[PDB]
Each structure stands twice: as structure tokens, then as C-alpha cells.
Design a protein around this ligand. Structure first.
Ligand SMILES: [Hg+2]
Length: 121
């Protein structure tokens, strides 16, 4: 459908746009661009996990002050250090109406799901 906004469920700060989102292995959602990396911080994880297609290095949080809401993790996919987010950490907002939507799973969120391309970086 139309490009949409993802806002931090807790503070509502603008996180990214659906246009920036990319899909890895059909079920992992990452976000391209430098603007997005101005919104989250990374905190190393002492006892990560061993995901099937990537290495988990840390959890990421809303860079905002007094928020620090869990957004997902930061991983090494192939040769990239990228963020992978959980839709439940966001509110999806329609730009032209302001209608806000809360999802728990990416499967139920129907936007243009574009496969991750190493080309784009
Ligand atoms: Hg936030």
C-alpha cells in the first residue's frame, strides 16, 4: 500500500518508514539508511543466542531520553552489521489520516515486503 510510519510504541518518536524496511530470510525485518541509525542505540548482549542465519551481537533501543524501549537486535548477516526489529515495538501510523495500528506479528502487517539486497548494502 502507501508508505507508512513506524513510531516507538512507548514514546511515539518517528523511527523509520516502511519504505526503508527490508526483509531477510522472509521473516527478519531490517531497516536501511543512516537516518534510522540516529534513532536507536546498541547495548552488547553478554549471553547472545545462535540464530540460524546470523550472529546476534546486541539488543537495540530507542535512542530517546527516558524511553529506551526494546526495538529488536543488531546482527551480523553475511558481511553486514544490521538492525533487526520487532513490529510489536512500534505503532504503525498512516501519514494521511493519523490512524495508528498496533501489530504483534509481521505476518499480519501488509505493506510492500522487499527482499534484502546486498547491492543496496
Ligand atoms: Hg522511544
Amino acid at each position: 500500500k502507501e508508505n507508512k510510519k513506524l513510531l516507538c510504541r512507548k514514546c511515539k518518536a518517528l523511527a523509520c518508514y516502511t519504505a526503508d524496511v527490508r526483509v531477510i530470510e522472509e521473516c527478519h525485518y531490517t531497516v536501511l539508511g543512516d537516518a534510522f541509525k540516529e534513532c536507536f542505540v546498541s547495548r552488547p548482549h553478554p549471553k547472545p543466542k545462535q540464530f540460524s542465519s546470523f550472529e546476534k551481537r546486541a539488543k537495540i533501543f530507542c535512542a530517546r531520553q527516558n524511553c529506551s524501549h526494546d526495538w529488536g537486535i543488531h546482527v551480523k548477516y553475511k558481511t553486514f552489521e544490521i538492525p533487526v526489529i520487532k513490529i510489536e515495538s512500534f505503532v504503525v501510523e498512516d501519514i494521511a489520516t493519523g490512524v495508528q495500528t498496533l501489530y504483534s506479528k509481521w505476518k499480519d502487517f501488509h505493506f510492500e515486503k522487499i527482499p534484502f539486497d546486498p547491492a543496496e548494502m
